[PDB]
């Protein structure tokens, strides 16, 4: 699993010999990848979310927990007991799939809404057979009333759960399968209605149920810990300012962060331990991203003793030891005296963290992609497979075996293929990473292996008529 | 208290001698009042909500409970402990007041938004002094971002609580009173922000907190029970159909209704007890009024064994013993084979039950006004006071003593005066009752005293040029 | 016609002997009718629109002109030539009818959306026959996508035109009549589509076509002139301020107003003529009511030499001889130093002038109802007919002949009956007049016959339980 | 000028010797450029707009005409006479600029809203000086209330006009320059207000003024004619279907198209002339793109004899010689029995034609970029200049002269630089072309030089971690 890769790298001590780093940064696994050039010396503030960037949740343990609690919630509100026999399977869901609430399919699409993979339950629908429901092998992906795009890591159990349910109702004799849902005499459950229940249940688990409590009760089981995290953060604070802006509330943030910094030392072995808050020039919780990058909400102050909000809108200045709640990205800029391009924001939400901070504020962006830590291994190991496909393509271009090679390549990633492509065709997610993430990597810790004023470089882009 | 009046009438046995009823209906206390003529023989369906029509909550016990739990909730989220020393005072709030979130005032207004009473906390602001904040002694009451109209019985504790809070912060030395809220150094709590917290807390208490549980745990303390309720309902079912459409969920509805019908007999003394559901041709919960009278929500079916919803949209026909959830007013009409003017709908929400069913569907309407049971007593007893005002008015009209008489009249109702007027000026609430409630009374039980095919009558209306 | 009544009164000289006025005001024809009490001494500003209050358009000449030009426009865009044989008929349309774009009917309804009259083309649909399309004999009149309410005087030709068209297509053999429109082989014209064309054509005629030009080219034919208008306005300016706020542009306003004041004298015979602008403390054109009573538009200044707008938002103060364009009702209040209840606004639009200024700003209101000048004559002459109906009603109430009496009464007003009622049932329009017009009359000139500080009086209102 | 290039190519006879074409297609000027691979053999329908694809308007004559009429319109509504001394200057505007209505600047930006060029009037604001108004040298370009993106060819005069006006008011002593507009005593004209007037005037000229009439009165002066247009269209009709979908009305379309086909021959010299409509399997006018690619409008049929719409929604089938009006892209698909990827749509609106048909329907797209015909010449001629910049960049990257080289390169395109870049940075427009236009060229006629089943090819895309 990708978190196993991350954990193994996490257990390593960080030898800060520059000659070691310069050659350690070269390994693809520890590389920072570059979509648009970025001069690190111009970055004056380093900003973070917490989800899967600071707090790396262990896979598949965390997904299974969320899956299990979501299933229990559905059963709790009246779904059949048989749901309880579901068990999370990490090999099925690929992140970034689109659930079609009309026909109950999971779709993998490219940036233009072309179908690359279609599955109904666990049945993979071949090209011709998809044309009945998708005449142009295409969806309008911004039709948000019909399509839901599962591009978060938290979406992974939900992704698998949707397929389990379609599979279950399809094969349960009590039900009759219809085009848009399931009939049970005088009851009709549409896929849309089903999807809404799943949505509700997942949200409930996350914010009202026992997920956070189960998580903090057993942090060693659910959360990766890395001694290098305080090291990197302390190095960032030497050359600029460091801030936290998370959607989580203070109570959860404090529990998780305390754990993440729980070593018998500070930044480096031998140094005194320091509380996690001391690593940040500004701490902001209840961020409500992506709204945060627009109007946001009123700026509040957290009573860190009680973990409740103080009464009133906070109107004061940045003060040492203060914790903020809500506000907006402008809050950060004002308090830290920064401009957007002075900021490198590090996050795991392609939409809510990266796309939005880039498009709305022109922040510089770093996207953490936890799966990359494994997708790389598969890509480098089965490289020959892709290289063959490329050869088969350019040969045919200058003129069905391609489909089999496509299939065999994709299956090494999972049943839903790579996060980034299906054979030679890039996914929507891949196109969004390239377009909005200035930098990306399996972990932001990979920044440790690059010098203070490194210039990350991407090739200039030319139009076809310019080439 | 008005519920004491209702309780005393409730304890009475119903002698169905027609000569007794014809003369019993004459007492103002047991009368049904008429705004627009209504032939009862044309009514084919009698419909009900549950809140304060079937389930008469005891005053001030129920209001105090809701007040106490709301205060605890505010303290729970970080308001000062001193809130706990508040105690509900039934003499202060009159229903139907407008809270101005800009300036933190409770206002009593007429149908045209003219100010009749203005109070800041417990300080009553005289006419001239209101002109500073209300230059035209007027508000645009449909500006719903600024003004919140507290016209439900459930709104009564909230009404008092808002004044308590304004009073508390005004007189708490830790705070500085500003035009639009309270300053505490680097914190500023606007009245708007305060109001939002109170709104949230009240909603939470009602739907997530312990109000329903505290209520059902001690029904004798909190809910009026009347042996005449099953009698009247059984008489309605003889001449037409009877339905329930409540916003409450089934579990609460079943608890309350079971209690309301808990006598050692059925409709009449000596008869076998019958379960409450047998009194209804159609039972619908989770109604989501007022949306119910528009598009509504999808029609669901309740699993009455588990109190959970069955899976799927219910597509079947009206069946004996079925309980519905959601749907819309059209559901009722279709299933009962009724047209709007065939329906007399009985409710306690001037907006959500009465105004909306009238305007959206042309239903006939009966408004239960629990306070009337006391307001009448005050009106008939202090009649001379009003009669004097009338004389003082027509005398001046054909030409400040009026203000003192106005004051002394209004104080007999409470500090916020009558629900229906301030001196000679009618409230917004009164104008809405007249406009949208075809019939009204302190209790719908008053229908018992009228014969099967009574013709309720109001005088025809003439324009001034027609007179 | 009503404008004949107005013209006859207009030709009269105004004898300002107070004994004459006090007894002249008594004639119903010259009365100001009162819905809510109004002390004239408290009014500090008198405000006017121009349409049918200052500029009384002659009937049926003006309606016929607008009708003719609208028909020509429809033919111009491709409707059949046969339309040209239509001719305006003042006896058919009553103001305030609702056009149902689904079924192509004109409806007369009460305040609650109950059907009083239904006509398809020129065919009057009896009660039972309407139930097929209107099961509850009711419409939701605020469903503005389906229903259009024709309550302006300018709406009168459009009202008749809609019926002409439904009649024409119904009886033209080239077309097949369907429930929602007309079929012509591969073409289907819905009533909705038809209605939209008529709407567009009417708007075009009014703002881009030759209506205004045809009007100003022959003012004597199209506009009533009254020597008493400058007299009354000059008397208003003695005791307070006078303003104009019209939707018309300056060029049209100046043409019309110049004509209205074109006498060889000023306020009184023998006095020097004064230009119309000198009668106003503030002149505002392009008002864009009803938006005017909300946010309005930016305040502009008219270059009265060129009749074009000066460049820029006007930021200066009230200046003598300035003409404003756009702005909002707040503009008036600020510049004149008035509060809403200091203002009596006189207009002919029940919605755009009266309802909106009342509800949004708490202005005092005077509604001019030109038809009243004839409706009164019919009401007073055929009084016995109504009196019979009243007797027949109370007799039956204490127990189909009523329907015949209803019919015979209504036909004296026109085919669509009185503006104010159908038999004993009040129209929506009547209920709106009572609710929002503080005062009303056939002409605002009727104010001339009342003294400076008259107290207009309406009886106090009592609820049924208060009576 | 670019239209001179197009005209010169237009005058050439088309030698259809395949060996000539294969080597003629190679010249960059006659090339079709490829962003995403496209197999022409899969294309079953060729679709067209008319603006600048079929009807190539001569530059700068057409822009000057539109400019002149727009200026006259502004003067007509009250702008100062001095405007009349403006004269269109083709060297100033580059297409695709953003007008900032807050500060009155024209901006050239990249895909991420970074400022590349800023001009206030004709004053070019250097980098540091822009930071006062643009702290992050960035705009949120989708803030459509503030920013207007001038990316159409019709936008070119408006672009120049906005700068003329800012220049004029800035230097006219009667006015005082403020941050957000111009003061003239009691008048304030904001740049926003000014921009709205210009918008209105341009729209008026285009749809109510004399632009279309002036154009059709002298087609030889304003419109490029090419004998190869009927040749290519006839070749397209051999292998698939051909349709027209334009926003223009039929009367204008017929005038223009008749002219475009006015030769003494048909497809090839010597052949009989054929009317323009015979080249199309489907003709649709009043398309209302981009709405056309969503819900569209109701499908109408044009009476081609009168040029007016027939009465009714057209419900029939595709018929020979029928002309449609409105409808939606689904209309095309249904009538032609096509799926989106079967369609190559050729247009000149990057947003309304290309982006929308691609994103909403998955059509294949061909973008005509008239300026390319000159931008290429500048690019190939001054190639060394760009090559130097590239060298200076990679040298510095591996380490202000760059700025001077950037400047000198950009000035060869105009004062606002290349449509596609500023030095090494690509414009928003360039990024949109690459993302949404599958193919592009200076003229669609360039398709003539490619064989029936050509495979247009673009290189597969790889992520940085995949490289």
Residue C207 belongs to a domain: yes
Tracing tokens 């000062």 back to the chain, one arrives at: B80
Maximum CA pair distance of chain B?
73
Whether chain C has a CB inside 8 Å of the CB on B393: the answer is yes
Is residue C267 helix, strand or coil? coil
Domain holding D247, by residue range, is 2-49+225-368
Residues β-bridged to residue B33: B440
Residue A150, min C-alpha distance to chain B (Å): 24
> Do C176 and C260 have their domain in common?
no
Burial of A330 (0-12, 13-18, 19+ CB in 10 A): middle
Structural domains of chain C, count:
2
Q: Alpha carbon B36 to chain centroid distance?
A: 20
Report yes or no on chains D and B touching (3+ CB pairs under 8 A). no
Cβ count near D252 (within 10 Å): 19
Tracing tokens 């950037």 back to the chain, one arrives at: D406
Do B236 and B242 meet the contact criterion of CB atoms below 8 Å apart? yes
Residue C125 belongs to a domain: yes
Residue A157 belongs to a domain: yes
Residue C257 belongs to a domain: yes
Read off the tokens for C368.
């001019």
B358 vs B341: CA distance, rounded Å = 9
> Do D84 and D102 have their domain in common?
yes
Read off the tokens for C5.
């009544």
Burial of D264 (0-12, 13-18, 19+ CB in 10 A): exposed
Technique that determined the structure: X-ray
Q: Alpha carbon B282 to chain centroid distance?
A: 23
> Do D240 and D178 have their domain in common?
no
For chain D, give the number of residues. Answer: 467
All chains having 3 or more CB pairs closer than 8 angstroms to chain A: B, D
C-alpha to C-alpha distances, D136 to A341, A362, C251, nearest whole angstrom: 7, 8, 49
CATH number for the domain including C353? 3.40.50.1000
Verify whether the Cβ–Cβ distance B465 to C113 is below 8 Å: no
Residue C170 belongs to a domain: yes
Read off the tokens for C130.
């309407």
Do C426 and C420 meet the contact criterion of CB atoms below 8 Å apart? yes
Whether chain B has a CB inside 8 Å of the CB on A147: the answer is no
3-state secondary structure chain D: CHHHHHHHHHHCCCCCCHHHHHHHCCCHHHCCEECCCEEHHHCCEEEECCECCCEEECCCHHHHHHHHHHHHHHHHCCCCHHHHHCCCCCCCCCCCEEEECCCCEEEEECCCCEEEEEEECCEECCHHHHCCCCCCCECCCCCCCCEEEECCCCHHHHHHHHHHHHHHHHHCCCCEECCCEEEECCEEEEHHHHHHHHHHHHHHHHHCCCHHHHHHHCHHHHEECCCHHHHHHHHHHHHCEEEEECCCCHHHHHHHHHHHCCCCCCCCCCCCCCCHHHHCCEEEECCCCCHHHCCCCCEEEEECCCCEECCCEECCCCCCCCEEEECCHHHHHHHHCCCHHHEEEEECCHHHHHHHHHHHHCCEEEEECCCHHHHHHHHHHCHHHHHHHHHHHHHHHCCCHHHHHHHHHHHCCCCCCCCCEECCEECHHHHHHHHHCCEEECCHHHHHHCCCCCEECCCCCCCHHHC
Whether chain B has a CB inside 8 Å of the CB on A318: the answer is no
Q: Alpha carbon B463 to chain centroid distance?
A: 31
Nearest CB to B308: which of A77, A193, A308? A77
For chain A, give the number of residues. Answer: 467
Q: Over the range A27-66, which residues count as b (16 or more CB within 10 Å of their CB) and which as e?
A: eebbbbbbbbebebeebbbbbbbbbbbbbbbbbbbbbbbb
Q: Alpha carbon B451 to chain centroid distance?
A: 26
Q: What is the DSSP letter of B459?
A: P
Whether chain C has a CB inside 8 Å of the CB on D187: the answer is yes
Is residue A213 helix, strand or coil? helix
D433 contact residues in A (CB cutoff 8 A): 463
Closest-approach residue (CA) in chain D for A376: D465
Residue C262, min C-alpha distance to chain D (Å): 29
Do C422 and C117 meet the contact criterion of CB atoms below 8 Å apart? yes
Whether chain A has a CB inside 8 Å of the CB on B187: the answer is yes
Verify whether the Cβ–Cβ distance C465 to B379 is below 8 Å: yes
Angle C48-C51-C56 from CA coordinates, rounded to 5°:
105
Closest CA to D139 of D181, D94, D109, D102: D109
Pinpoint the alpha helices (H) of C106-227: 127-130, 155-171, 191-207, 211-217, 219-222
Whether chain A has a CB inside 8 Å of the CB on D134: the answer is no
Is residue A425 helix, strand or coil? strand
> Do C31 and C101 have their domain in common?
no
Quick check: bond before C60 cis, omega within 30?
yes
Do D81 and D276 meet the contact criterion of CB atoms below 8 Å apart? no
Residue B448 belongs to a domain: no
C-alpha to C-alpha distances, C393 to A69, A234, C132, C150, nearest whole angstrom: 69, 91, 28, 30
> Do B154 and B273 have their domain in common?
no
Boundary (domain end) residue, out of C183, C217, C251: C217
Whether chain D has a CB inside 8 Å of the CB on C313: the answer is yes
> Do A266 and A132 have their domain in common?
no
Residue C161 belongs to a domain: yes
Residue A417 belongs to a domain: no
Is residue A270 helix, strand or coil? coil
Cβ count near C337 (within 10 Å): 11
Do C46 and C240 meet the contact criterion of CB atoms below 8 Å apart? yes
- Chains C and D form CB pairs within 8 A to the count of 70
**What are the phi and psi torsion angles at A176 (to 5°)?**
-110, 125
> Do B212 and B229 have their domain in common?
no
Whether chain C has a CB inside 8 Å of the CB on D75: the answer is no
Sign for the pseudo-dihedral over CA of C65, C71, C75, C81: negative
Radius of gyration of chain D from Cα atoms? 23
> Do B24 and B107 have their domain in common?
no
> Do B238 and B331 have their domain in common?
yes
Whether chain B has a CB inside 8 Å of the CB on A172: the answer is no
Query: Which residues in A52-104 belong to E strands, given as ranges?
Result: 56-57, 97-100
B305 vs B323: CA distance, rounded Å = 11
> Do A104 and A199 have their domain in common?
yes
Q: Alpha carbon B159 to chain centroid distance?
A: 13
Residue D68, min C-alpha distance to chain C (Å): 20
Residue A281, min C-alpha distance to chain D (Å): 21
Boundary (domain end) residue, out of D341, D368, D395: D368
Closest CA to A106 of A96, A114, A431: A96
C-alpha to C-alpha distances, A219 to A2, A3, D110, nearest whole angstrom: 18, 14, 45
Q: Over the range B429-442, which residues count as b (16 or more CB within 10 Å of their CB) and which as e?
A: bbbbbbbbbbbbbb
For chain C, give the number of residues. Answer: 467
> Do A101 and A231 have their domain in common?
no
Boundary (domain end) residue, out of C307, C342, C368: C368
Do D225 and D260 meet the contact criterion of CB atoms below 8 Å apart? yes
> Do A159 and A263 have their domain in common?
no
């Amino acid at each position: 699993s990708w978190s196993d890769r991350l954990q193994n790298a996490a257990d390593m001590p960080a030898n800060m010999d520059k000659h070691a780093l310069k050659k350690y940064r070269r390994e693809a696994y520890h590389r920072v990848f570059v979509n648009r050039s970025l001069a690190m010396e111009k970055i004056k503030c380093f900003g973070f979310n917490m989800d899967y960037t600071l707090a790396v949740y262990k896979s598949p343990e965390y997904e299974s927990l969320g899956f299990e609690l979501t299933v229990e919630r559905l059963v709790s509100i009246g779904y059949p007991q048989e749901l309880l026999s579901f068990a999370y399977d990490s090999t099925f869901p690929t992140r970034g799939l689109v659930f079609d609430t009309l026909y109950g399919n999971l779709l993998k699409v490219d940036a233009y809404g072309n179908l690359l993979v279609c599955a109904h339950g666990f049945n993979f629908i071949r090209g011709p057979e998809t044309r009945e429901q998708y005449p142009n092998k295409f969806i309008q992906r911004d039709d948000t009333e019909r399509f839901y795009i599962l591009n978060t890591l938290f979406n992974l159990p939900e992704t698998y759960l949707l397929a389990c349910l379609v599979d279950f109702f399809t094969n349960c004799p009590r039900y009759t399968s219809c085009e848009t849902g399931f009939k049970d005499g005088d009851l009709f459950m549409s896929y849309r209605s089903m999807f809404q229940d799943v949505r509700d249940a997942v949200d409930w688990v996350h914010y009202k149920g026992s997920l956070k409590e189960k998580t903090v009760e057993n942090l060693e089981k659910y959360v990766v810990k890395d001694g290098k995290l305080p090291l990197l953060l302390s190095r960032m604070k030497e050359v600029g300012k460091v801030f936290l802006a998370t959607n989580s509330d203070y109570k959860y943030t404090d529990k998780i962060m305390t754990y993440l910094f729980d070593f018998p030392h500070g930044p480096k072995p031998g140094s005194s331990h320091r509380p996690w808050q001391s690593y940040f020039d500004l701490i902001l919780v209840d961020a409500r991203k992506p709204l945060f990058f627009g109007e946001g909400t009123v700026l509040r102050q957290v009573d860190t003793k009680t973990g409740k909000l103080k009464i009133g809108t906070y109107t004061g200045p940045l003060q040492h030891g203060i914790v903020y709640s809500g506000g907006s990205s402008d809050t950060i800029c004002d308090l830290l005296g920064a401009k957007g391009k002075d900021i490198l924001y590090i996050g795991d939400h392609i939409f809510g963290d990266i796309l939005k901070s880039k498009k709305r504020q022109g922040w510089r962006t770093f996207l953490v992609i936890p799966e990359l830590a494994q997708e790389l291994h598969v890509w480098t190991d089965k490289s020959s497979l892709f290289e063959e496909l490329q050869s088969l393509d350019i040969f045919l271009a200058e003129l069905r075996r391609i489909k089999k090679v496509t299939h065999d390549m994709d299956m090494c990633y999972g049943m839903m293929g790579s996060l980034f492509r299906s054979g030679s065709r890039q996914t929507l997610f891949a196109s969004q990473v390239m377009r909005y993430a200035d930098l990306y990597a399996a972990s932001f810790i990979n920044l440790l292996y690059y010098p203070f004023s490194y210039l990350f470089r991407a090739a200039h882009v030319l139009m076809p008529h310019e080439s």
